Amino acid sequence: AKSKNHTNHNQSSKNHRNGIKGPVPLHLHNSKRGSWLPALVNARRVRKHNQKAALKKRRERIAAFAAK
Amino acid sequence: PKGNNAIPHVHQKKHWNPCSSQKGNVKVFLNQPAQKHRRRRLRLLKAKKVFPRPLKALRPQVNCPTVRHNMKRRLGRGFSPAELKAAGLNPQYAATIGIRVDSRRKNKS
């Protein structure tokens, strides 16, 4: 007994019932995994120095607040 | 559907359940409080019969085996003849005065 082969009749209605959700904004899930390696390695060294500077800046702010 | 569940391994494929066609294979514990009372009642009766001898015969202290339990201590089966001889007791006479004797246990320390 033959039956129906394929259809897309109601699929658009089902998809839009909860809506076609918009894409994740570019500022989230912006991982650089798998990108060009030499730039990634160079950026890692910069970020490590930035973390050290961030630690020093907070130490200075703590001392400044304590003194004042 | 089935969904995300653990893969079942309930192991209940034999004729364990008693039914119209199966005698079953089960063990219940409905008599547990009664057996506890009976065991205590028997112990009290045994104490009366053997009075004034202690209910439980004297047993030695032993070290639990394996590296997992070597720090623990517990009672062993019976006193070795070497321990009894050092204490000044003939092992056959010791068994007559309520001392358990084990001729299998060695004294390695």
Binding site: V24, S31, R33, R61, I62, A66 | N4, N5, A6, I7
Partner: protein
């Protein structure tokens, strides 16, 4: 008729009564329902909302976590101002990894015996929410805190573990089982550890 297709999808599940059978929980809800309605305090509104939540949605907090966050607030805080009262709508648990803590005033639904002993021995004090309403009726000088829930085994199990980028733990009592095919490159394939989103 009015075209209102999918209007029911706007509705959200908002609970107004606790599922808890605790009479003392109900007394606190009665107290802070009145305070949230009759006072202009964001603290009172949040505390009342959190008193209705389920036990799983009231995560426990550790004493070490409380001590750390107060220290972060204690620095950059004027020397003439008193430290705020740590307020937790939930259980407060002791931490054996922090031996030394400062003296803090902590209000919580419940304290563990060790946690209460640690707080008192450090020179602090433990408060119940009726005392908190008496001395801070609007929540002035309070530090509202929440416990952690993302480290729970239930959360770690959520999601399918066989899809690329997933690192959820499977539902298996036997750790050694379910380790060969789909988990190793040498057995057909290995599920990809990372996937861009």
């Amino acid at each position: 008729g009015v075209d209102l297709t999918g209007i029911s999808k706007k509705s959200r599940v908002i609970r107004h009564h606790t599922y808890s059978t605790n009479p003392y929980i109900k007394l606190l809800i009665k107290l802070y329902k009145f305070l949230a309605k009759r006072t202009s305090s964001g603290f009172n509104k949040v505390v009342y909302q959190r008193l209705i939540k389920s036990r799983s949605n009231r995560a426990p907090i550790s004493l070490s976590r409380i001590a750390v966050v107060m220290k972060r607030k204690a620095v950059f805080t004027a020397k003439s101002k008193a430290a705020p009262i740590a307020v937790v709508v939930g259980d407060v648990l002791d931490d054996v990894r922090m031996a030394r803590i400062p003296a803090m005033r902590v209000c919580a639904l419940r304290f563990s015996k060790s946690a209460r002993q640690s707080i008192v021995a450090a020179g602090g004090e433990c408060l119940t929410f009726d005392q908190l309403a008496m001395i801070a009726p609007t929540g002035k000088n309070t530090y509202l805190l929440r416990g952690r829930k993302s480290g729970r085994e239930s959360v770690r199990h959520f999601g399918a573990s066989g899809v690329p980028g997933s690192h959820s733990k499977p539902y298996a009592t036997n750790r050694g089982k379910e380790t060969k095919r789909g988990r190793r490159t040498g057995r057909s394939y290995k599920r990809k550890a990372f996937r861009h989103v």
